[PDB]
Amino acid sequence: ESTTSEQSARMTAMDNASKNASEMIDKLTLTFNRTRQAVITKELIEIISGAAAL
Amino acid sequence: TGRIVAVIGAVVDVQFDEGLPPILNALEVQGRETRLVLEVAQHLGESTVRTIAMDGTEGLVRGQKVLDSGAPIRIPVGPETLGRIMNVIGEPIDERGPIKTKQFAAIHAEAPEFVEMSVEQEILVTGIKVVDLLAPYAKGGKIGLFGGAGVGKTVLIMELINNVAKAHGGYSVFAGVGERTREGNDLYHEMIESGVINLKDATSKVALVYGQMNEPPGARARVALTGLTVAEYFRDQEGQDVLLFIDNIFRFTQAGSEVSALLGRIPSAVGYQPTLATDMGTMQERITTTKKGSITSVQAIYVPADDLTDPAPATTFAHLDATTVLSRAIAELGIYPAVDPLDSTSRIMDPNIVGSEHYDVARGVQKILQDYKSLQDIIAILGMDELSEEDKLTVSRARKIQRFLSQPFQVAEVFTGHLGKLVPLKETIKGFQQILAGEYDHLPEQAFYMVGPIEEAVAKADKLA
Amino acid sequence: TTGRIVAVIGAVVDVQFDEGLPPILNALEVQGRETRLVLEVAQHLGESTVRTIAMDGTEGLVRGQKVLDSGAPIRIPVGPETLGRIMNVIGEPIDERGPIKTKQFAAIHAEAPEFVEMSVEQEILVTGIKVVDLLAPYAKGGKIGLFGGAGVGKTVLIMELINNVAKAHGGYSVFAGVGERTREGNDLYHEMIESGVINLKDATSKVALVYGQMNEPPGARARVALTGLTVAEYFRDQEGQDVLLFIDNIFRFTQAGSEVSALLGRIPSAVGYQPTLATDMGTMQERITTTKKGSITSVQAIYVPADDLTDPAPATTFAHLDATTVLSRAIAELGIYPAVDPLDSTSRIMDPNIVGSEHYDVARGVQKILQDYKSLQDIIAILGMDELSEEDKLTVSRARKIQRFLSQPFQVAEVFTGHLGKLVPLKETIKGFQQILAGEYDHLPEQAFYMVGPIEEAVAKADKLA
Amino acid sequence: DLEETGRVLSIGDGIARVHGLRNVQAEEMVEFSSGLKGMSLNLEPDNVGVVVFGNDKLIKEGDIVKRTGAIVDVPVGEELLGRVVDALGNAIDGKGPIGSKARRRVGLKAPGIIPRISVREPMQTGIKAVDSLVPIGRGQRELIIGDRQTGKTSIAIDTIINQKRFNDGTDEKKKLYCIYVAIGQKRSTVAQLVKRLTDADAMKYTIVVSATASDAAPLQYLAPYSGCSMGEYFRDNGKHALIIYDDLSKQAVAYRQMSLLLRRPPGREAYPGDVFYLHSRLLERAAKMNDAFGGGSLTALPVIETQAGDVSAYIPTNVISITDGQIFLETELFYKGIRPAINVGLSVSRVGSAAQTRAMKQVAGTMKLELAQYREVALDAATQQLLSRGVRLTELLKQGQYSPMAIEEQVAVIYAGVRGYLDKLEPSKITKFENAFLSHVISQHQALLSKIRTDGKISEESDAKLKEIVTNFLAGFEA
Amino acid sequence: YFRDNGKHALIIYDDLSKQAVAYRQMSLLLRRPPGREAYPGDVFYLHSRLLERAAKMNDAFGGGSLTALPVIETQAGDVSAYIPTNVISITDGQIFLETELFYKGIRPAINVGLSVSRVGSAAQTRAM
Amino acid sequence: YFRDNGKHALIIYDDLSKQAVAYRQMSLLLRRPPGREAYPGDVFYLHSRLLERAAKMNDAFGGGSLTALPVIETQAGDVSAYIPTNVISITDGQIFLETELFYKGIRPAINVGLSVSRVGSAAQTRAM
Ligand SMILES: Nc1ncnc2c1ncn2[C@@H]1O[C@H](COP(=O)(O)OP(=O)(O)OP(=O)(O)O)[C@@H](O)[C@H]1O
Ligand SMILES: Nc1ncnc2c1ncn2[C@@H]1O[C@H](COP(=O)(O)OP(=O)(O)O)[C@@H](O)[C@H]1O
Ligand SMILES: [Mg+2]
Ligand SMILES: [Mg+2]
């Protein structure tokens, strides 16, 4: 009896874990892409300032 | 007659003593073995212009003579462009001699004015079941074609060309913007095999304009406009509904970015040109419905870094009236065309535009596929007999629904050995409505797979077993 | 003497003088205009030309147009006659009540008090706001800063502070509106007339108003904080007295500096900011200070560009403050108001020798349990609550109630909440949290601790539901 | 004559550089020989820098430039009602000259503190979720913000159409003139939009100002200022106008294009440091006037498009920090079918209760609270019943497009939900209940709705009447 | 020379990452406007004109061919970097190698999942 | 002066983050081109030359010493930042303080795991 209950509960906990992870992944990917673009932008503005100052 | 005063890569400065060429004017460099066109970009002051070269600048000398042609780049327009390939400046690059046209046309035409606009949304019937039902195309609209290689993308483009000429009579233009040369050759020959291009007669349905990956950015930036110009003759002078393919929009934006950098302009967010949205806008706005006719445009879209918020796809997305999403997963299931029935979208999917009957069936087909997705996430974890009595009914219908979404293409007849089908909108609707109503629950799934109208879905079952 | 305008771009005007070049900071008067247009000298460019910053719009200016040197910086009305009045950047009345008949004027540029003039007096200023009083208390005569991104509660908080502290304070207030909403200025003015803190009849007004809002061109937004601070400086010095100074929003001073730096000729620094960000800020902030002559309790609202506290503007501001209240969008989205981050707000007087060991121990106890809870959240986020021991389940329970008990309804927020505003004595804030920490209320639901005053109101709210 | 005239030195780098125009004013409108207009932006020792309000490619070195003597202004007045104009106030609808008798400077500074009074008159949208939870008052600025295709424009358009009911009536304090400014949109889209307005008979009280996707950046820059000036004519003449800026995201990218070509130093996302001020000076001009200035108002609904729900971005946080509230639309709520996709949690009206009918406070004054609490948590105790109420109320706030509701019809619907009548009901059925219930109270209980409207309150006699309606209605249908 | 004279050649560019760095040096010192990662705008065009010269000639043009194997070095496996982005978009496919596979004992360390040949089957004998 | 006259001094630079900012302003306004984060190209040198002046002197020079405790402000815990990394690379060791630790009750908020000092003379003490 215990084993059947434990395996079913293990299934559920892992299902919940992977759903929570997927939600975090989705949110972090958005932050990743924003940050990715912002680093290109920032870098480039620095080089352009460096060029204009000469 | 101007004289070259500076050359730095694809940027050439030219001095004129009296007749200064307006911005956008084409200039022809004298004493070169092949045609070298410079497009005026700026008036620098002191009778000097800055121009962008349409081909390589090697061998240019300061003092070398340059003629103002008196107008923008002008290209051949008319029926004799069909089945031909031209470059950005309208020269034939298919070694079949002169494009003997009775008219030429300038490539920087203004978009139609606000008064010229149609007040009404209207449907462009492709004859393709997935598209027409779930994500229909609009006349005068822009469609975003998503997906990489090996997903039947070239076969879909060719089918759209074939079906549009088959059903409406209208013509197609294909602008290859920054494509690999090898792929332009493949497409050319794939078009000859299918019959959309015919080298023996006048029955070609498409005109090609190519601006390859290895050409200067000025050339790659104007290819889309050259194609638009060819298209605009058919719409305006022949009063037609024309199809403009652009492959692809990312490279149009990329070349715009390079031209802006050549001119020494300060880059905007993520490296793109400051004029990103106006560059796009001046081009996309020429794709519209007017009173003489319409141009509809299918645009292959590449998404850098898988990032839909990247300024390039983000800017394009504003102009799109529909999306057609091609997927490997759908192809791996054996479904062709490999259109994702849930990820594809259309702005004209409104009861007032497509009709009450169209919207209901489409929203009903969309729902049952969404059910099938949630029902399949219970079978894999648990089992098939863990679901109710009504659950297996929605599965059986939805399996036949995705099979009646698949379609044999006319342009794919040479390879698979099966005859292709063009299905009217009315037969697509009433066919799908009958599956949801349950009128075909007594039939096997394989009867609905790779057929045309529902009359074939009934008859195929009789032939089998 | 008189100059001629040689260039105009937005707020930046170049002026050539044939004789008598005006010193930097001198106010120039443009001739031939319907209302007074002051140009402040910013730079000597050479060749008898000065570069200046306009204090109003420059539309209509023509190259050649004449300019008169006033022979001094911008000078404004200071003194008791400013109380109950509204002035703009250049000291003109904007309340349609005629001249401000002061017996003195003062230049808006002044040397910051010297090191010798500093005071070291530390005395608690009780706000009646639980999170502040408990975790990061304000000091009388200290510098207070309220950090927040767009729409998180800076103005609501500053208005609660004006309501809660100004009454108890027995002196004069100055409110400077810097680059904020004109209608908030109108709301504030009429509310003060209604309450009586501004009187339109008698000399009993206790607040001087100075405004240069987000409708104004950058020169005005950059200088107007100096206008307000100059009024406060007079009350502090010529009286030797306790002044309250309120500013919403000091960020706009720095932002306005960046808009003109663009045209002044300076090579930009990080994120496109003026290279002089930190020194401009220091020259201004160091005058907003208590001295041996008198006390200024200052409260400044501080905008945070795109919620980024590491942005140069808010980053440079922290060093100027004695107490900081940091508002968090994430805390607001839990519906917790005021949205103060308990793990990012600090005070100089949060010291056992100053607030007492009891106040201190409870404050640190609260912060410890909130941090411990914060550490569990990456695990909870994925693995959920079932992986936690029964001792950690109690830390989560006690921490969620402590989070909620730090929330409070504000008098000024009844228009948004539909709840009566609450003022909580320090002794009741201390006892209240000290009891939750002790587990004395482990039997109540979380939601009973939401939007209440003292602890007895949680117990009452818990009995309202079965 | 180089005092009143000039000649183009250079063109193609954004701003045109012009020799001469010695007597030209800063911000003065000037005329090019090609028929284009421009604005004197930069006055320099040796040149005038001129922003071109059209296609700069039509200008050549040596072209003649002429002073107009007037600071940039636009046609203003009631002749613009029912008309479509570009950013300069010129007709583009094909119906000939506007016929305007007055003009206003586009860059005129917003009214100060003294000429104003607190907003107190409702600006009714007819959309349940807005009029109940995010009520707008006349003279307010309220942002509409969300991703592409989340229903932003629809809120604006349904708001304009809703005013017909007041504009056809007598009650003159209740009339509302509308201005739709389209910035950076397709011409086809704008034409479909004026069609819909014409179908609804909304065009007769609306001005459309359009600077579209193929219009030069300076025209997109100018458009909102031009529309705003037209609104200000009503605002200052004792009338009420509503302005829609659709959208300010597109205006800001046109201004960034102009700023980059001028080589102004870019900050976050390459925007110049004055992007905040671009929008702050514009939005300050929506105002409620005190009676000494005629009592009029101009209400503004700016539109901002976010990218993948990022409301913490530069342009979004700027505008949030300018306006008196925001209506946040969300993609997740949208494509799930919750339309309008208002995130009731995040959406605020920094005015709130002040500009709302008493009958709405009596219902929405509890519905507002029960929904930010619900959002957080997205057998058990009171935590679960928060979720049970939240789902019913959400469904209750759903509304089809072009389905205006008068405030009294809105309170009766909200009443049924907020009092707990649908608490026993299943969430799926809420939509069907509302449609049948509303059409029933509209059919025979016009007396009740009339009582709630005129009294501007739910009186005890209305309260007990409605209680008997809902109870007897609830039971009696086929399921 | 071999392609045009009916013969077949293979060319390896080891590596194009280093070629772009050298080009960026020249371009910056010529004070040409810099772009992303300080590479000039024509850095795409640098590689596109080079790699489009690899071709298969038809019989009417001699039958010869030039095959190109450009090599790119990635940093931390970021294929979204500027130069790897350009070259991936130009070529007909990639063989992708990985340190994790290498040390696992997969040598050659080819990630088959991430590797593609867009010519594919057409370049194989029937037996294969 | 103490170092060289046979005595011992301790110097605290509170803090070097703010000195670099001032150096950046001055240098930019002198029209010296902006480097990484708009800092001057030699911001490393600004700090390296200063800290190298802390030294222990031999007996022939007086046996004196100067010890330095520079202070660096990080932003959101970013030790990998430009100025922080410079000074980490210069110093003999570092005491790392953390907000998490501070609020957890660890005060002084030293991260013992990350904090390092150079060996210690044998003499720190003997019973210690
Ligand atoms: N209340 C509603 N009920 C049903 N459908 C709606 C509702 N509101 C909007 N829609 C639909 O949502 C779609 C997008 O609406 P709308 O154009 O208003 O959004 P948007 O955010 O302004 O889009 P865009 O990005 O194109 O500017 C439209 O097709 C519209 O018909
Ligand atoms: N203490 C509070 N209680 C309830 N609501 C608040 C509180 N502070 C802020 N809010 C909500 O946030 C909105 C913006 O607050 P405000 O202080 O105006 O923002 P900002 O930080 O931009 O000045 C208010 O209109 C209100 O809806
Ligand atoms: Mg505020
Ligand atoms: Mg819209």
DSSP state of E36: G
Q: Of the CATH numbers 1.10.10.410, 1.10.287.80, 3.40.50.720, 3.40.50.300, which one belongs to the domain with range A14-54?
A: 1.10.287.80
Are the beta carbons of F70 and F48 closer than 8 angstroms? no
Is C63 designated active site? no
Nearest protein CA to atom 21 of ligand 1, as residue: D149
Nearest alpha-carbon partner for C217 in C460, C432, C11, C64: C11
Which residues does C67 contact at the CB level (< 8 Å), separation at least 6? C2, C3, C4, C5, C15, C28, C29, C30, C31, C39
- Tokens 């609450």, residue? C422
CATH number at residue B60: 2.40.10.170
| Whole-number Å distance between alpha carbons of D243 and D302 | 8
H/E element holding F11? strand F8-13
- Tokens 């250049």, residue? C90
| Whole-number Å distance between alpha carbons of B141 and B130 | 18
Nearest alpha-carbon partner for C52 in C263, C221, C258, C224: C263
Query: Letter for the amino acid at D290?
Result: N
| Whole-number Å distance between alpha carbons of B229 and B109 | 8
Which residues does D11 contact at the CB level (< 8 Å), separation at least 6? B23, B42, B43, D17, D56, D59, D60, D61
Are the beta carbons of D409 and D441 closer than 8 angstroms? yes
Nearest alpha-carbon partner for D70 in D35, D21, D115, D30: D30
Specify the domain boundaries for CATH 2.40.30.20 within chain D: 1-70
Query: What does this entry list as its resolution, in Å?
Result: 2.1
Q: Which of B179, B190, B258, B456 is catalytic?
A: B179
Using N-to-C axis directions, what is the helix angle for B454-463 and B425-436, rounded to 10°? 60
Query: Letter for the amino acid at E76?
Result: A
CA angle, C400 then C403 then C406, to 5°: 150
H/E element holding B244? strand B241-247
Would you name the residues of F annotated as active-site residues?
118
Same domain, B392 and B314: no
DSSP state of F110: B
Mutation site, A11, A20, A41, interface C, largest C CB count within 10 A: A20
| Whole-number Å distance between alpha carbons of D56 and B46 | 18
Residues of D in contact with B45 (CB under 8 A): 9-10, 17, 61
Bridge pairing between strands C172-178 and C207-212: parallel
CA D191 distance to own-chain centroid: 19
> Of the bound ligands, which one is closest to the alpha carbon of residue C338?
2
Nearest alpha-carbon partner for D178 in D201, D152, D195: D201
- Indicate left, alpha or beta for F63 from its phi (over 0: left) and psi (-120 to 50: alpha): left
CATH class for domain D71-356? alpha beta
Q: How many CB pairs under 8 A join B and E?
A: 49
Helix intervals (H) in F9-122: 16-29, 43-51, 82-90, 99-104
With H, G, I as helix, E, B as strand and everything else as coil, classify residue B19. coil
Nearest protein CA to atom 8 of ligand 2, as residue: C153
CATH number at residue C407: 1.10.1140.10
Is B179 designated active site? yes
Q: Choose the final residue of a domain: C27, C46, C73.
A: C73
H/E element holding A19? helix A2-53
Same domain, B321 and B236: yes
Neighbours of C45 (CB within 10 A): 14
Classify the C-alpha dihedral C346-C347-C353-C358 as positive or negative.
Answer: negative
Terminus-to-terminus CA distance in chain C, angstroms? 82
Q: Please tell me which residue of chain A has the smallest CA distance to B264.
A: A48
Shortest Cα distance, chain C CAs vs residue F110, angstroms? 16
Same domain, B418 and B331: no
Does the annotation flag B88 for ligand binding?
no
Give me the architecture of the D357-479 domain, per CATH. Answer: Up-down Bundle (1.20)
Q: Choose the final residue of a domain: B348, B370, B398.
A: B348
DSSP state of E18: H
Bridge pairing between strands B37-45 and D240-246: unpaired
Nearest protein CA to atom 13 of ligand 2, as residue: C151
Query: Letter for the amino acid at D383?
Result: T
The method of structure determination was: X-ray
CA angle, D136 then D142 then D145, to 5°: 130
Residues of C in contact with A52 (CB under 8 A): 267
Is C180 designated active site? yes
Residues of C in contact with A28 (CB under 8 A): none
| Whole-number Å distance between alpha carbons of C305 and D124 | 33
D2 φ, ψ (degrees, to nearest 5): -80, -5
Contacts of C among chains (3+ CB pairs under 8 A): A, D, F
Same domain, C423 and C340: no
Specify the domain boundaries for CATH 3.40.50.300 within chain D: 71-356
Quote the radius of gyration of chain B (alpha carbons, Å). 25
Contacts of E among chains (3+ CB pairs under 8 A): A, B
CA angle, C372 then C376 then C377, to 5°: 120
Task: Return the HEC string of chain C.
Answer: CEEEEEEEECCEEEEEECCCCCCCCEEEEECCCCCCCEEEEEEEEECCEEEEEECCCCCCCECCCEEEEEEEECEEEECHHHCCCEECCCCCECCCCCCCCCCEEEECCCCCCCHHHCCCCCCEECCCCHHHHHHCCEECCCEEEEEECCCCCHHHHHHHHHHHHCCCCCCEEEEEEECCCHHHHHHHHHHHHHHCCCCCCCCCCCEEEEEECCCCCHHHHHHHHHHHHHHHHHHHHCCCCCEEEEEECCHHHHHHHHHHHHHHCCCCCHHHCCCCHHHHHHHHHCCCCCCCCCCEEEEEEEECHHHCCCCHHHHHHHHHCCEEEEECHHHHCCCCCCCECCCCCEECCCCHHHHCHHHHHHHHHHHHHHHHHHHHHHHHHHHCHHHCCHHHHHHHHHHHHHHHHCCCCCHHHHHHHCCCCCCCCHHHHHHHHHHHHCCCCCCCCHHHHCCCCCCHHHHHHHHCCC
Bridge pairing between strands F65-70 and F55-56: antiparallel
Q: Which long-range contacts (CB under 8 A, 24 or more apart) does D467-473 make?
A: D467/D419, D469/D441, D469/D445, D470/D415, D470/D416, D470/D419, D470/D421, D470/D437, D471/D421, D473/D437, D473/D440
Burial class, B23, CB count within 10 angstroms (exposed 0-12 / middle 13-18 / buried 19+)? buried
Residue C338 CA to ligand 2 center (angstroms) comes to: 8
Q: Which long-range contacts (CB under 8 A, 24 or more apart) does D464-473 make?
A: D466/D412, D466/D415, D467/D419, D469/D441, D469/D445, D470/D415, D470/D416, D470/D419, D470/D421, D470/D437, D471/D421, D473/D437, D473/D440
Query: Letter for the amino acid at D380?
Result: D
Nearest alpha-carbon partner for C422 in C124, C133, C123: C133
| Whole-number Å distance between alpha carbons of C375 and C386 | 16
Are the beta carbons of B199 and B207 closer than 8 angstroms? no
Which residues does D269 contact at the CB level (< 8 Å), separation at least 6? A38, A41, B269, D256, D313, D314, D315
Same domain, C103 and C157: yes
D182 φ, ψ (degrees, to nearest 5): -100, 120
Residue B293 CA to ligand 3 center (angstroms) comes to: 53
Contacts of A among chains (3+ CB pairs under 8 A): B, C, D, E, F
Burial class, E57, CB count within 10 angstroms (exposed 0-12 / middle 13-18 / buried 19+)? middle
- Tokens 């002035």, residue? C87
| Whole-number Å distance between alpha carbons of B338 and D127 | 41
Which residues does B98 contact at the CB level (< 8 Å), separation at least 6? B92
Is the bond leading into C73 cis (omega within 30 degrees of zero)? no
Contact at CB, B43 and D84, closer than 8 angstroms:
no
Same domain, B315 and B237: yes
The dotted CATH code for D1-70 is: 2.40.30.20
D288 φ, ψ (degrees, to nearest 5): -105, 125
- Asked whether D401 lines ligand 1 (CB < 6 A), one says yes
Nearest alpha-carbon partner for C350 in C363, C366, C367, C368: C363
Full residue range of the structural domain in which residue B32 is found? 1-72
Bridge pairing between strands D297-305 and D240-246: parallel
Are the beta carbons of D127 and D159 closer than 8 angstroms? yes
Q: Please tell me which residue of chain B has the smallest CA distance to E48.
A: B214
H/E element holding F56? strand F55-56
Which residues does D226 contact at the CB level (< 8 Å), separation at least 6? D74, D87, D88, D89, D106, D181, D209
DSSP codes joined into one string, A32-51: HHHHHHHHHHHHHHHHHHHH
D383 φ, ψ (degrees, to nearest 5): -65, -40
Residue C184 CA to ligand 3 center (angstroms) comes to: 9
> Of the bound ligands, which one is closest to the alpha carbon of residue D397?
1
Q: How many CB pairs under 8 A join B and D?
A: 128
Terminus-to-terminus CA distance in chain F, angstroms? 32
Terminus-to-terminus CA distance in chain B, angstroms? 80
- Asked whether D185 lines ligand 1 (CB < 6 A), one says no
Contact at CB, A48 and E34, closer than 8 angstroms:
yes
Specify the domain boundaries for CATH 1.20.150.20 within chain D: 357-479
Same domain, B170 and B218: yes
Nearest alpha-carbon partner for D371 in C335, C416, C447: C335
Query: Letter for the amino acid at C454?
Result: P
Per-residue CA distances from E94 to E21, E107, E112, E118, E122 (Å): 21, 17, 10, 9, 16
| Whole-number Å distance between alpha carbons of D159 and D399 | 13
Are the beta carbons of B174 and B157 closer than 8 angstroms? yes
Per-residue CA distances from D99 to D35, D75, D96, D325 (Å): 20, 9, 9, 37
Same domain, C317 and C443: no
Same domain, C438 and C455: yes
Query: Letter for the amino acid at B331?
Result: A
Does the annotation flag E14 for ligand binding?
yes
CA angle, C254 then C257 then C260, to 5°: 155
Same domain, C258 and C328: yes
H/E element holding B221? helix B217-237
DSSP codes joined into one string, E68-86: EEE----STT-TTSHHHHH
Task: Return the HEC string of chain D.
Answer: CCCCEEEEEEECCCCEEEEECCCCECCEEEEECCCCEEEEEEECCCCEEEEECCCHHHCCCCCEEEEEEEECEEEECHHHCCCEECCCCCECCCCCCCCCCEEEECCCCCCCCCCECCCCCEECCCCHHHHHHCCEECCCECEEEECCCCCHHHHHHHHHHHCHHHHCCCCHHHCCEEEEEEECCCHHHHHHHHHHHHHCCCHHHEEEEEECCCCCHHHHHHHHHHHHHHHHHHHCCCCEEEEEEECHHHHHHHHHHHHHHCCCCECHHHCECCHHHHHHHHHCCCCEECHHHCCCEEEEEEEEECCCCCCCCHHHHHHHCCCCEEEEECHHHHHCCCCCCECCCCCEECCHHHHCCHHHHHHHHHHCHHHHHHHHCCCCCHHHHHHHHHHHHHHHCCCCCCCCCCHHHHHHHHHHHHCCCCCCCCHHHHHHHHHHHHHHHHHCCHHHHHHHHHHCCCCHHHHHHHHHHHHHHHCCCCC
Are the beta carbons of B92 and B28 closer than 8 angstroms? no
Same domain, B357 and B412: yes
Are the beta carbons of D390 and D374 closer than 8 angstroms? yes
- Tokens 């790699």, residue? E51
With H, G, I as helix, E, B as strand and everything else as coil, classify residue E113. coil
B366 φ, ψ (degrees, to nearest 5): -65, -45
Q: Please tell me which residue of chain C has the smallest CA distance to F40.
A: C269
Query: Letter for the amino acid at B297?
Result: S
Bridge pairing between strands C143-148 and C172-178: unpaired
Are the beta carbons of B140 and B294 closer than 8 angstroms? yes
Residues of C in contact with F31 (CB under 8 A): 267
Q: Please tell me which residue of chain B has the smallest CA distance to A8.
A: B382
| Whole-number Å distance between alpha carbons of D391 and D374 | 8
Residue D147 CA to ligand 4 center (angstroms) comes to: 10
- Interrupted backbone of chain A, residues before each interruption (C–N > 2.5 Å): none
| Token pair of D42 as six digits | 């930069």
Domain count for chain B: 3
- Interrupted backbone of chain C, residues before each interruption (C–N > 2.5 Å): none
Are the beta carbons of C139 and C348 closer than 8 angstroms? yes
Same domain, C53 and C99: no
Residue D288 CA to ligand 4 center (angstroms) comes to: 27
Are the beta carbons of C325 and C345 closer than 8 angstroms? yes
H/E element holding F13? strand F8-13
DSSP state of F94: B
Q: Choose the final residue of a domain: C316, C349, C382.
A: C349
Chain C residues bordering chain F (beta-carbon distance below 8 Å): 266-270, 275-276, 278-279, 309-310, 315, 319, 343, 364, 367-368, 370-372, 374-375
Residues of E in contact with A48 (CB under 8 A): 34
